Amino acid sequence: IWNSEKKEFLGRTGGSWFKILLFYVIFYGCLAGIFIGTIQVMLLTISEFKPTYQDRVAPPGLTQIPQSQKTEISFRPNDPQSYESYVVSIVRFLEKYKDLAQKDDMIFEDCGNVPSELKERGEYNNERGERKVCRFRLEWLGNCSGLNDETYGYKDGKPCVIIKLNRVLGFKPKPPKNESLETYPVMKYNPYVLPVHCTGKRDEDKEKVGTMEYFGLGGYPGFPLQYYPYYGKLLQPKYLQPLMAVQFTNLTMDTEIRIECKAYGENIGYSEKDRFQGRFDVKIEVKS
Amino acid sequence: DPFYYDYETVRNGGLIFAALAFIVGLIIILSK
Amino acid sequence: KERDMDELKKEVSMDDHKLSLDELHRKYGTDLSRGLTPARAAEILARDGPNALTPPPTTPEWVKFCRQLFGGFSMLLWIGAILCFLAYGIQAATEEEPQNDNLYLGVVLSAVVIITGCFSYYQEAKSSKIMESFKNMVPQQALVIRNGEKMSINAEEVVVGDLVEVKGGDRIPADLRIISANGCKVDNSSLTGESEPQTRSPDFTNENPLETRNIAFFSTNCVEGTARGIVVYTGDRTVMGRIATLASGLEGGQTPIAAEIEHFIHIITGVAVFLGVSFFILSLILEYTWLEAVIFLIGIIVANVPEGLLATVTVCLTLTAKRMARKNCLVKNLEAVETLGSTSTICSDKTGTLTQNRMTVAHMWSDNQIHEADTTENQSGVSFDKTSATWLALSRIAGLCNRAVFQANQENLPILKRAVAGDASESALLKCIELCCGSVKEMRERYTKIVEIPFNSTNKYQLSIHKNPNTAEPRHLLVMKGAPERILDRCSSILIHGKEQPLDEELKDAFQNAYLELGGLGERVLGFCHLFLPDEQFPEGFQFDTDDVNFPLDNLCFVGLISMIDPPRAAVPDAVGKCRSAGIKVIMVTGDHPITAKAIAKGVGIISEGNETVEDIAARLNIPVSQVNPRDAKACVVHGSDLKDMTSEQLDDILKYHTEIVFARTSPQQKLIIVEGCQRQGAIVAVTGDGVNDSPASKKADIGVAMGIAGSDVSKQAADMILLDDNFASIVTGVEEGRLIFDNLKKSIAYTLTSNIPEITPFLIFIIANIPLPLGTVTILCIDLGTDMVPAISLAYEQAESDIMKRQPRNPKTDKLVNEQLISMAYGQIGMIQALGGFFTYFVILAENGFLPIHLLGLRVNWDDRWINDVEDSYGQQWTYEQRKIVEFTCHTPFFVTIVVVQWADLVICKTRRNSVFQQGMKNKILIFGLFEETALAAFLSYCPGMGVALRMYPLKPTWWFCAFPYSLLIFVYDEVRKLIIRRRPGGWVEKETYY
Ligand SMILES: CC(C)CCC[C@@H](C)[C@H]1CC[C@H]2[C@@H]3CC=C4C[C@@H](O)CC[C@]4(C)[C@H]3CC[C@]12C
Numbered sequence A: 001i002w003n004s005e006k007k008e009f010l011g012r013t014g015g016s017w018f019k020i021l022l023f024y025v026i027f028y029g030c031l032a033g034i035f036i037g038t039i040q041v042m043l044l045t046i047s048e049f050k051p052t053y054q055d056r057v058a059p060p061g062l063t064q065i066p067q068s069q070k071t072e073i074s075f076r077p078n079d080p081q082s083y084e085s086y087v088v089s090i091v092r093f094l095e096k097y098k099d100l101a102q103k104d105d106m107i108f109e110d111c112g113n114v115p116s117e118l119k120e121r122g123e124y125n126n127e128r129g130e131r132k133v134c135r136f137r138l139e140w141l142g143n144c145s146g147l148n149d150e151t152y153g154y155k156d157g158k159p160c161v162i163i164k165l166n167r168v169l170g171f172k173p174k175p176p177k178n179e180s181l182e183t184y185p186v187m188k189y190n191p192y193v194l195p196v197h198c199t200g201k202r203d204e205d206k207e208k209v210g211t212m213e214y215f216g217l218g219g220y221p222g223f224p225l226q227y228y229p230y231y232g233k234l235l236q237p238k239y240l241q242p243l244m245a246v247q248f249t250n251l252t253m254d255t256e257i258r259i260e261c262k263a264y265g266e267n268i269g270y271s272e273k274d275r276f277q278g279r280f281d282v283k284i285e286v287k288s
Numbered sequence B: 001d002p003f004y005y006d007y008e009t010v011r012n013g014g015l016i017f018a019a020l021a022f023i024v025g026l027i028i029i030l031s032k
Numbered sequence C: 001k002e003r004d005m006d007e008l009k010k011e012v013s014m015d016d017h018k019l020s021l022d023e024l025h026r027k028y029g030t031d032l033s034r035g036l037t038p039a040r041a042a043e044i045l046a047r048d049g050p051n052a053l054t055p056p057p058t059t060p061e062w063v064k065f066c067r068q069l070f071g072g073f074s075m076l077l078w079i080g081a082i083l084c085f086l087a088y089g090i091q092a093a094t095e096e097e098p099q100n101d102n103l104y105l106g107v108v109l110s111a112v113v114i115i116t117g118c119f120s121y122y123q124e125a126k127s128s129k130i131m132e133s134f135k136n137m138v139p140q141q142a143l144v145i146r147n148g149e150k151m152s153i154n155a156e157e158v159v160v161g162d163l164v165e166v167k168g169g170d171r172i173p174a175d176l177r178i179i180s181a182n183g184c185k186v187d188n189s190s191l192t193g194e195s196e197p198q199t200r201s202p203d204f205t206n207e208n209p210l211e212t213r214n215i216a217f218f219s220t221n222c223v224e225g226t227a228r229g230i231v232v233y234t235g236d237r238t239v240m241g242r243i244a245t246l247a248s249g250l251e252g253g254q255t256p257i258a259a260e261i262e263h264f265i266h267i268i269t270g271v272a273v274f275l276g277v278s279f280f281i282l283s284l285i286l287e288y289t290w291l292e293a294v295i296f297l298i299g300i301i302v303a304n305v306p307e308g309l310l311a312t313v314t315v316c317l318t319l320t321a322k323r324m325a326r327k328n329c330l331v332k333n334l335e336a337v338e339t340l341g342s343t344s345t346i347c348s349d350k351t352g353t354l355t356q357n358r359m360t361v362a363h364m365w366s367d368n369q370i371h372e373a374d375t376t377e378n379q380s381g382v383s384f385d386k387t388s389a390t391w392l393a394l395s396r397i398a399g400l401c402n403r404a405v406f407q408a409n410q411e412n413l414p415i416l417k418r419a420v421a422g423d424a425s426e427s428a429l430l431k432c433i434e435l436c437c438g439s440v441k442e443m444r445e446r447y448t449k450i451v452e453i454p455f456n457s458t459n460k461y462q463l464s465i466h467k468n469p470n471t472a473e474p475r476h477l478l479v480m481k482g483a484p485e486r487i488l489d490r491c492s493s494i495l496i497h498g499k500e501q502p503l504d505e506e507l508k509d510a511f512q513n514a515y516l517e518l519g520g521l522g523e524r525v526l527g528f529c530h531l532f533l534p535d536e537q538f539p540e541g542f543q544f545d546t547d548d549v550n551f552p553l554d555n556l557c558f559v560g561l562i563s564m565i566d567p568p569r570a571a572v573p574d575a576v577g578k579c580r581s582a583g584i585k586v587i588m589v590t591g592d593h594p595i596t597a598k599a600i601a602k603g604v605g606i607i608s609e610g611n612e613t614v615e616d617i618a619a620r621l622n623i624p625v626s627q628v629n630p631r632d633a634k635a636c637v638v639h640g641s642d643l644k645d646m647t648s649e650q651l652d653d654i655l656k657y658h659t660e661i662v663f664a665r666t667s668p669q670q671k672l673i674i675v676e677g678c679q680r681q682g683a684i685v686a687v688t689g690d691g692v693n694d695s696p697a698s699k700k701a702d703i704g705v706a707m708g709i710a711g712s713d714v715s716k717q718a719a720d721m722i723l724l725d726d727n728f729a730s731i732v733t734g735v736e737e738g739r740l741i742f743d744n745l746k747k748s749i750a751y752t753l754t755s756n757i758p759e760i761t762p763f764l765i766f767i768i769a770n771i772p773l774p775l776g777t778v779t780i781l782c783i784d785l786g787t788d789m790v791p792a793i794s795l796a797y798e799q800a801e802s803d804i805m806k807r808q809p810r811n812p813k814t815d816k817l818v819n820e821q822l823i824s825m826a827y828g829q830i831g832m833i834q835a836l837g838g839f840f841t842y843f844v845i846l847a848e849n850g851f852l853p854i855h856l857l858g859l860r861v862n863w864d865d866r867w868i869n870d871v872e873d874s875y876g877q878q879w880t881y882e883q884r885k886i887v888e889f890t891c892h893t894p895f896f897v898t899i900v901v902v903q904w905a906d907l908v909i910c911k912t913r914r915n916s917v918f919q920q921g922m923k924n925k926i927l928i929f930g931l932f933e934e935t936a937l938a939a940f941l942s943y944c945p946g947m948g949v950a951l952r953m954y955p956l957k958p959t960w961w962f963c964a965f966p967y968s969l970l971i972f973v974y975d976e977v978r979k980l981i982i983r984r985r986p987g988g989w990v991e992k993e994t995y996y
């Protein structure tokens, strides 16, 4: 106990403190001023419509409704508290998709009941008014979210997960060519839709046990081109991206079998570092 | 496509730069 | 109980030296002529210990490497490391990242301290290697007498109390009480500091055993003549042994740089724990649990410690020591490169330190006129008129009565620097005549020596008689020299300009006041005279013997005086000039006589012209010495006699009220007490010396400085610095270098501490604003350890911002290395500009990539989550984990590159603490290179292939490089106008607040 109070000074030396504190208030004031200045100019260098770089999202990711702790849905068919969190995540997910949720014919456009050619709306300018948004009805996923018609345990007996494609502005998905290299038992709709297929283990020996049924638009397992491109949160808020549900029906119950899901196309690619890029991974165990 | 950046010419540029800058620094600290 | 040991050892000695031979041989149980029996000798030799100094109590093993691994700074980094491993241990509470973060970091810290330790240990090892390389111990055998037969035996077989005979050239084996002597002069220079050879005689002379003439000392060389003595002291029991053992038993204090680094360390820890605690509380305050909050505390505290500053500092000091080692100044210790700069007082030994210790002829008196010889080493001075016949007669007489001869190996060597067997006075005379009058050998054999009388210790008259080479007169020529007053007693005639004369009291007292003028000049004076003999009475066949007297010893012809002294080393007066100019207090401390000491001190600049002791005032005033008020005298000469009787307060008054000071006739222990007396004042003290008498003082001093050749071994060992060339001017360079590196150290330190702000702030606001992390662990290391190093070391290549020898030594209490103003700069002002630049590039990159700053807050929660692969930016786009995380890591890279870009400016502006950058210029090449490389490597870390994998460092869109620029420019400008206002207004508020 020395410096704290001394003759003519507060710890350490306090006569002039007002000078130092004022100086730092002003100096820091001007620093903050400057910084915010530069940030402002930098924000005047930012387009109000499109991001100046999209390149890091280039290989879009494949994502799920019930995003789990680590890619894992483990639950009891009987226990209502077992499937609670997942089912809830589905309800809050597709709460946007409800038919009464998109009423307005001003901002909502009813497009095909069949996958159709890409919907190009002008340019990304504000020259055209706020863009219309293609409607997605829950019925397009049958037996999965089923509107109010079943499941409704939403898979309670046997598991189901909705595959969704990541939104990328201006992205126009190109399905594989009519010349397709080993794309698995997929329908003939390659011209109008981006496909998704699932397997037990990636390229290697699998403990593949299962039988799957997909629900897309029009009966094809995929995403219709008519919803793309996505025009951004400024131009198309209330935009509903495509969805396709994947229902695993027959499976071996008390064991964990692993799943890989893949979207195919020229506009789609995959990373070995990123398992959520261009593709998908889900570990599922239904125990009872 | 807008989704392609050329990171190869950038990489190459930064590397050529590194080379030049360094050997130039070597030139500096040896004044003969 | 080594305290009691050191208490008895700090005390000046006693002795039995005053005795009758009967009593000495009664107490020691010995025969005078016969010594003792070989049985008694092999018995005593086995009773206590062999005669030699116990080898050093030192010799620490190479495990002393561990020393370089702690210090105080390596301690800050060890503790930091420990904190890393702790926070990691705490982070094993869940599944966690630090495998790339906290463990990695901790390991790195430990690696920094280890490596640094290895480096500094290696260099100090280099120093000790060359020191031991300089060690040459040639065994020397003592000539003893046992059972009557003189036997030359190992000097380690010599015991207490047995007869020993020493000759000219023989080194004195043990401490001997002299029983008998013939013409025996011994060199006490190293041990007692007595410059001229002190003659040794069996008689009791002085009360003090050192200055008394019947005691011979261990390690002193008998210069000429023969003597015998009973060994009073053997081995460590000896004088130089008690001196050496006192030396080994001392402490070197704390080096001032150790203290500054410690201060700074309490500063850095102070701020680190302040921030870590305040933020521990704050982080707790919002959300985060005791666990995570603890992790934050540790993270911040540890982020606040500069791993690089230790390495860089070790290397700066090491560089300066590379210059020292180039200039033939070796520092045994790496922290001892600075101390000289902070030294406010230098205690200097006289003989063999300031002075060549080599007796040379100064002035002469011939034909009433006092002529000066050329006393310079390279003979660039003036030779007076040698044409006069009196100088011829004189040079004949001086050469003819010399027992000194040139040894076998000196021909090529310069007449001065070449070696001579004989006395010191006789060596100076021999060299003087071989120089000025032609070769002495011819003239020495031209006159054939018939009988000579070696100098009696009493009356000190030394004479010889030779025949006559002159073709005119075949008279017998008798030549004698001695004490001026006794050579005034025995004589009548005097020679002037080649013709005799009787002595009249006018010219007699002219010679007497001339003798008093040269003697009072500090040079001791030797009288010279001759008489031809009356060959009518003393025919050519007559044999005149030393049995009694065959010669008239009166009515001789006196010729002239020759005076002599040991000059300084050449660069000494200019050196002391510089040190007085720098504001260091120069103090002489010598065991020599005060009459010489005062003259020497006046000469080299220690006591300047125009300043008087009480004694000089009372001399001009014709009054008793106690009449003069002592406060009116700046300069003083303090007898060794008074010193013992003086107290602490008395020494403190003497040191306080006297500007130019000299202590003479002082024992080594009194030297150490002087040094401790200076150190009591609170002032850093340096001590420069030669022989073993300077062992305890140069040990105790905050820094010792020894002489590499003409200095003894124990006083090299006790010294923290050696001058291998023995050049005293190097001392000045020392105080120069020590003064420089300090400021340079500051600059360096400022630089690195300035990188701490923009490094730390990324993790601070990360916790606060909950944004995705702006700057990562690896990037931060890439800064501290990777880039900043070269610039930071380059800063040690800075030159002087102004003349540094014009300013007084620093105030160790006021002027500190890392001080409140420095931290006010690095953390307070500049560091902030760097952090801002960083968060700019952060926001630039992120906003340009789709996440606007507005939207960027609170994001980390969802952002650092691995399983949320739909993550909405400001555009409604979605990102998986690795996508956005890549953006985060390419947000780490340009923030790091930003740090580089701002460190440019910071580098240039830390270069100059006062002058503008357009004054000091850019002339530092290591600085320029530092910039070129620091950048080249930065662009290398970003743009190298496989860095994104290895370092999580990915390339930058070239635009990213140019975000950081305006901030750097601001830094340059700001610091430039600051160092402008400081120069234009040195009142001053900017100067009190900022200047560090
Ligand atoms: C003291 C200061 C001003 C030194 C000036 C050096 C500047 C002009 C140098 C240093 C680092 C350099 C950059 C290093 C990386 C490359 C990548 C290359 O593909 C595009 C240019 C770019 C981005 C360089 C532009 C020029 C650059 C910014």
Ligand SMILES: C[C@]12CC[C@H](O)C[C@H]1CC[C@@H]1[C@@H]2CC[C@]2(C)[C@@H](c3ccc(=O)oc3)CC[C@]12O
Pocket (backbone or CB within 6 Å): C097, C098, C101, C102, C105, C295, C296, C298, C299, C300, C302, C303, C304, C305, C763, C773, C776, C777, C780
């Ligand atoms: C791993 C880390 C844990 C706390 C929080 O989850 C944020 C994580 C990322 C950043 C990391 C911290 C850990 C401490 C740091 C290395 C620590 C640090 C930084 C630099 C340095 O030299 O020393 C310590 C401060 C922040 C730190 O870099």
Ligand SMILES: *[C@@H]1O[C@H](CO)[C@@H](O)[C@H](O)[C@H]1NC(C)=O
Pocket (backbone or CB within 6 Å): A142, A143, A150, A213, A247
């Ligand atoms: C849907 O479920 C019903 C009954 O639960 C079943 O009959 C029908 O086959 C299922 N269809 C699909 C496509 O899953």
Ligand SMILES: [K+]
Pocket (backbone or CB within 6 Å): C302, C303, C304, C305, C306, C307, C784
């Ligand atoms: K640090």
Ligand SMILES: [K+]
Pocket (backbone or CB within 6 Å): C251, C252, C698, C699, C700, C701, C702, C703, C704, C718, C719, C720
């Ligand atoms: K010492």
Ligand SMILES: [K+]
Pocket (backbone or CB within 6 Å): C305, C306, C307, C752, C753, C754, C755, C756, C784
């Ligand atoms: K630092």
Ligand SMILES: [Mg+2]
Pocket (backbone or CB within 6 Å): C189, C190, C193, C349, C350, C351, C352, C353, C690, C691
């Ligand atoms: Mg000496």
